């Protein structure tokens, strides 16, 4: 197996730690959802190729501009995360996270991931957002942002229900394998 490195970036409200935990755990966290994620080396077989994918989180590093880039050396694929229940986290992608990722990781594929897709049709989420003249992120808004920032692709998932989680990581492995 070849070794590839994945790093997930995005605002704290995007659920990046939850996504890494749910993919790596083996049996969903039914009793306790961990606060933090250390690291993990996933054994993935995608399109007949065996890869060891090391997974890393940037959670806790958002306010520390000189510590955060130490997570970037030799990254093969970037997961740029936002939450579908937070249009504000999508708005932080093009001029906060994207210029940083392109400076420290030139030529590294970025996959824009819209997390918490289950909240798109949640009435509590729709009510809370409507109080700030907002609504859940629409699929076309996610796709247009991925297009605008030069992302390799756009994907959606729900860490809560596990839907679309496996597909994100298999695609991230394919992206890390490309020239």
């Amino acid at each position: 197996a070849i070794r590839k490195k994945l790093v997930i970036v995005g605002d704290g409200a995007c659920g990046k730690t939850c996504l890494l935990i749910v993919f790596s755990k083996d049996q969903f966290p039914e009793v306790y959802v961990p606060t933090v994620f250390e690291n993990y080396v996933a054994d993935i077989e995608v399109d007949g190729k065996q890869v060891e994918l090391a997974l890393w989180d940037t959670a806790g590093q958002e306010d520390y501009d000189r510590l955060r880039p130490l997570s970037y050396p030799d990254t093969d694929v970037i997961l740029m995360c936002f939450s579908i229940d937070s249009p504000d986290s999508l708005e932080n992608i093009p001029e906060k996270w994207t210029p940083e990722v392109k400076h420290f990781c030139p030529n590294v594929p970025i996959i824009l991931v819209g997390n918490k897709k289950d909240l798109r049709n949640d009435e509590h989420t729709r009510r809370e957002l409507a109080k700030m003249k907002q609504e859940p992120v629409k699929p076309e808004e996610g796709r247009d942002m991925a297009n605008r920032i030069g992302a390799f692709g756009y994907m959606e998932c729900s860490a809560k229900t596990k839907d679309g989680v496996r597909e994100v990581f298999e695609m991230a492995t394919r992206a890390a394998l490309q020239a």
Binding site: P29, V31, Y32, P34, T35, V36, E38, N39, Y40, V41, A54, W56, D57, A59, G60, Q61, D63, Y64, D65, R66, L67, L70, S71, P73, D74
Partner: protein, 245 residues
């Protein structure tokens, strides 16, 4: 790690580690607070273990089996002894606090009611100064350590065979040289996340909520200080490149 501490922290949570008859006696809010405190200790145990892999497995093994130029091993594992000292002492205090709280006749049933005081002591005074100085030095030497590792693996056969040999066991899957370095750098930024979530479930005793709020502000001050003192070192950097920053 030592077997005693590994078995004590083997379960996914405090609610799964204690006896179910002991769990049944506590309020939901106490269980939530205890699960987060258990995660802080469990991850501190793993962090100290990462530092022992660096000093005993990698560093010492290189000194005892390889012929490397003097100062190369230090460049690969900067401040590892100072870091292992700070965190082994902090882990000793966390584990002693759990041990004192055990019920008589039990090695697993306990409740930690007073974590704040221990966190204020760790993140203040001389111990805070030593963490600030050690992490400012470590994180400034981080990129240099990775580049030095990559050079040795690619150009030295005996170094490449040493790495493959000592990292072959499955328990070392996520603990290579570069992984251990990033695991250490990322550790200090996990503290505010764990402490804020412990604070969330610690409003029952007002002295405890205040101690945890003070500890949170202390950890944040330390992180801000470490962040401001970082400047990446580059092997063979010229003075002109440094003073034109």
């Amino acid at each position: 790690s030592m077997e005693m501490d590994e078995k004590d922290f083997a379960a996914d949570s405090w609610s799964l580690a204690v006896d179910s008859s002991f769990l049944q006696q506590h309020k939901k809010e106490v269980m939530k607070q205890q699960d987060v405190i258990y995660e802080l200790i469990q991850t501190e145990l793993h962090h100290v273990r990462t530092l022992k892999i660096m000093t005993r497995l990698f560093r010492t093994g290189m000194l005892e089996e390889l012929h490397l130029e003097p100062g190369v091993v230090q460049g690969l594992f900067p401040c590892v002894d100072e870091l292992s000292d700070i965190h082994t002492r902090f882990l000793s205090q966390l584990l002693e606090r759990r041990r004192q709280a055990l019920c008589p006749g039990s090695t697993r049933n306990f409740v930690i009611h007073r974590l704040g005081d221990l966190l204020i002591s760790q993140f203040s005074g001389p111990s805070a100064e030593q963490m600030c100085k050690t992490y400012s030095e470590f994180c400034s030497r981080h990129s240099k350590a990775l580049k030095l590792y990559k050079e040795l693996y690619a150009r030295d056969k005996r170094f490449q065979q040493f790495i493959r040999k000592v990292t072959r066991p499955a328990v070392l899957k996520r603990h290579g040289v570069q992984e251990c370095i990033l695991l250490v750098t990322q550790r200090i930024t996990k503290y505010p996340l764990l402490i804020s979530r412990i604070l969330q479930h610690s409003h029952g005793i007002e002295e405890e909520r205040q101690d945890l709020t003070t500890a949170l502000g202390l950890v944040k001050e330390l992180l801000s200080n470490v962040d401001e003192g970082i400047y990446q070192l580059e092997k063979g950097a010229r003075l002109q490149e440094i003073y034109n920053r």
